[PDB]
Amino acid sequence: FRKFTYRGVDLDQLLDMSYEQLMQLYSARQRRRLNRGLRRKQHSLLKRLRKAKKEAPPMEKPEVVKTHLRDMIILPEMVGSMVGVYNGKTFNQVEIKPEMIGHYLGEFSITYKPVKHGRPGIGATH
Amino acid sequence: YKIPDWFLNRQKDVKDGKYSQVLANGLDNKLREDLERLKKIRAHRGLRHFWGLRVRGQHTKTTGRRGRT
Amino acid sequence: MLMPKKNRIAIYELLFKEGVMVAKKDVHMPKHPELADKNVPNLHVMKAMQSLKSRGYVKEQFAWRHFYWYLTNEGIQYLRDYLHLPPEIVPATLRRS
Amino acid sequence: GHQQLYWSHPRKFGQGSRSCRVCSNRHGLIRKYGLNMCRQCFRQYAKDIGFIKLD
Amino acid sequence: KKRKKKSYTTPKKNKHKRKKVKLAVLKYYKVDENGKISRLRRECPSDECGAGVFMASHFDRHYCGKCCLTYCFN
RNA sequence: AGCGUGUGCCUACCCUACGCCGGCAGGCGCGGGUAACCCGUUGAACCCCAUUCGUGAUGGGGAUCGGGGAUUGCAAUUAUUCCCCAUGAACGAGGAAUUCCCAGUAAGUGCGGGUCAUAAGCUUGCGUUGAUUAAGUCCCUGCCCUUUGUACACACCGCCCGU
RNA sequence: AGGAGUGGAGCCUGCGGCUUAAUUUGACUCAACACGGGAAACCUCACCCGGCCCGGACACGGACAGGAUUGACAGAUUGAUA
């Protein structure tokens, strides 16, 4: 019937243009930091991605990674690599589709441990 | 009929761009189903929307104190 | 860690010329504009300060995020002996005290 | 020597960039008229700078 | 402020130190039945670095200076 | 109109006048100002209306839920920055208990600094409108004084009696 | 005698706790509670998590000139220059 959609633009059409065009012509926001420019020499991160994908099982999603930096969007050939959830030092294995990768914050789970809470009073007043 | 693509609330967004504003909640349902998607994907902003905690910059010091559960 | 001998000689000569050198402990600045061009980082200032503190050949005074050394006669003697400088080297200007 | 680990995030837009010119205090700094003073130090050297309590 | 019980991890971690070198023998081989000099110096076109700088021995690699020159036999 | 701030060597890190780009945050240029030299004659709050609100839950109103925005500067994440587009919680003078108020005072609002890389419900000053009210008292709350009592003097959070 | 805030609606600093990587460092009143000029995006919180160090002067004293490497490039990092 239809085909995959991502903010109005199509999947093969994602893969059509270049990375720079993908970022300049993307939807609102997420481009300004690299519009000003994210510094070069990003080759080591790409090589870590290559190593993780090689270590990843075939016909399977790439394994958890220990990255703390907010991701970006490139051609859909590789966007979808699993990025773990920072709890305090771990990276939870949660199925994050490439539509949520590169968005706000890498913690796709809770950030804090809630405290046990009693009735109003006693534990609410001195 | 000469109304610009800046004065209206269905401009291009996630999934596919929305077009045509129809009567009643013809797109309000469309703009609540994206909220449903946000809750169904288990996102921090989405789960905070589900829990009843406003996200656009709202602090919480007295909200949720009258008629809370 | 490998504190240079050439930088030490330059620093010693600069101190010997007048009697003070631009000393700060801030690390956000790698090299002071006067301290630049000669590979002089913050740690070099720190090491020189502590070595002269233990040596005692100059007396240290700290005031308003700045340091000041009191170049003594023993300091001049040790500086000559360890730098092997000629004996007629001494800050001895008289004009406009 | 600590240059390959520090300077990892430039510090020129926050309260860490401005410090008291006497005690390296980053709390309660006065930046009016380029004073770069903290309240305690400013009142300590208030008469020396030129300000006098008369109003 | 005090010890936070950090002495069980990295049990007195040692400062980085790869090898402890007295003399170089395998890198010096000028025996050609005549005693003449034999070298393998290779340098990048520049002024800061020349033939004086030493070389890391490898089966195919030429570590020269700080420019990170990569020139391999494929 | 008023107080008054503004071109910076630790740093493009200022106020910006004028024309271009757009309903919009913002970018371009020539620059004026190191200042009673420019912003600035500092053109907001207000008083008007021979046309349009009418006792709602709403054009007296805000998470007007979610999407369009972005700053010559580390990434605005329960995102303290942001110009655009209806809905709604709630309130009919706020039963106890009561701050603070002597004339340009209370109140009525806006501006400027400290905040500040953008950031004011805070705070610190400033003009901007002008009051029925008070020329009094110890009723309350305190505090001070005098006389008085004290077995208190660590001074009533004292001392001390008995089981 | 009058002009206003609340047990009358949303927002701003501090307590009974953060069994996560986490406030502990002030007040039982005026004279604590838009106060430490406290509007921490990270930088100021060291506080809380492998938080690069010898960069713990001691010439302590001794073998030895190698006493040693605070550098970046790879299963020498699943955290670009750790």
Domain boundaries, chain A: 4-123
> 3-state SS of chain B: helix, strand, coil percent to 5?
30, 0, 70
- Within its chain, how far is the Cα of A53 from the centroid? 16
Residue A18 backbone phi and psi in degrees, to 5: -85, 170
Task: Measure, in angstroms, how far nucleotide G7 C1' is from residue A21 CA.
Answer: 61
Q: Domain C3-97 - what CATH class?
A: mainly alpha
C-alpha span between C70 and C46 (Å, rounded):
17
PDB resolution in Å? 2.7
Closest C1' nucleotide to B57's CA? F79
- B9 token code pair: 């609330």
- B60 token code pair: 């919480």
In chain E, what's the furthest Cα-to-Cα distance? Answer: 68
Neighbours of C44 (CB within 10 A): 19
> Are A64 and A93 spatial neighbours (Cβ–Cβ below 8 Å)?
yes
> Are E64 and E44 spatial neighbours (Cβ–Cβ below 8 Å)?
yes
The boundaries of the domain holding residue B66 are 5-69
Structure determination method: cryo-EM
C-alpha span between B11 and B32 (Å, rounded):
15
Q: What DSSP string runs through C35-83?
A: TTTTT--HHHHHHHHHHHHHH-SEEEEE-SS-EEEEE-HHHHHHHHHHH
- B3 token code pair: 């109304």
Q: What DSSP string runs through E25-56?
A: -TT----SSS----------SSSS--TTS---
Domain containing residue D29: CATH number: 4.10.830.10
C-alpha span between C65 and C28 (Å, rounded):
14
Report which residue type is found at A120.
P
> What residues contact residue A3 under an 8 Å CB cut-off, 6+ apart?
A10, A11, A12
C-alpha span between C66 and C25 (Å, rounded):
8
**D22: three-class secondary structure by DSSP:** coil
Neighbours of E11 (CB within 10 A): 7
A51 in the Ramachandran plot: left (φ > 0), alpha (ψ -120 to 50) or beta?
A: alpha
Burial of A89 (0-12, 13-18, 19+ CB in 10 A): exposed
> Are C79 and C42 spatial neighbours (Cβ–Cβ below 8 Å)?
no
- Closest Cα in chain C to D1: C43
Residue in A120, A25, A114 with CA at minimum distance from that of residue A73 = A25
Q: Which residues sit opposite A86 in a β-bridge?
A: A91
CB within 7 A of strand G (chain E, 29-68): 63, 66, 68
Do chains A and C meet with 3 or more Cβ pairs nearer than 8 Å?
no
- A47 token code pair: 């090589």
Residue in A6, A36, A38 with CA at minimum distance from that of residue A22 = A6
- A41 token code pair: 């020499």
- C84 token code pair: 């092997």
Q: Which of C25, C44, C65 is most worth mutating to test chain D (most D CB atoms within 10 A of its CB)?
A: C65
Neighbours of A119 (CB within 10 A): 7
Report which residue type is found at E18.
R
**Secondary structure letter of residue A12 according to DSSP:** H
C-alpha span between C82 and D24 (Å, rounded):
36
Q: Which residues sit opposite B9 in a β-bridge?
A: none
Counting every residue, how long is chain C?
97
Closest C1' nucleotide to D55's CA? F125
Q: Which of A7, A103, A109 sits opposite B15 (nearest CB)?
A: A7
Handedness of CA A72, A76, A81, A87 (dihedral sign): positive
**C8: three-class secondary structure by DSSP:** helix
Question: Does residue D1 approach strand G to less than 7 Å at its CB?
Answer: yes
- C29 token code pair: 């600045």
Q: End-to-end alpha-carbon separation of chain D, Å?
A: 51
C-alpha span between E40 and C72 (Å, rounded):
54
Neighbours of C11 (CB within 10 A): 18
Q: Which of A7, A94, A111 sits opposite B13 (nearest CB)?
A: A7
* B56 in reach of chain A (CB within 8 A): no
Nearest CA distance, D21 vs chain C (angstrom): 6
C-alpha span between A18 and E62 (Å, rounded):
36
Strands (E), chain A: 5-6, 9-10
Residue owning tokens 């720190």:
C46
* Cβ–Cβ gap B15/A6 under 8 Å: yes
C-alpha span between C8 and C93 (Å, rounded):
24
Residue in A4, A67, A74, A108 with CA at minimum distance from that of residue B38 = A108
Residue in A3, A40, A34, A14 with CA at minimum distance from that of residue A98 = A14
Nearest CA distance, A111 vs chain B (angstrom): 9
C-alpha span between A63 and A85 (Å, rounded):
12
Residue in C64, C83, C88 with CA at minimum distance from that of residue C14 = C83
Count of domains forming chain B: 1
> Are E26 and E32 spatial neighbours (Cβ–Cβ below 8 Å)?
no
Task: Measure, in angstroms, how far nucleotide F7 C1' is from residue D18 CA.
Answer: 21
Crossing angle of helices C5-18 and C73-83, in 10° steps, is 140
Crossing angle of helices B28-40 and B44-51, in 10° steps, is 110
Handedness of CA C50, C33, D20, D16 (dihedral sign): negative
Angle at CA A111, nearest 5°, toward B50 and D11?
A: 120
Nearest CA distance, A93 vs chain B (angstrom): 13
Q: Which of B12, B13, B43 sits opposite A100 (nearest CB)?
A: B43
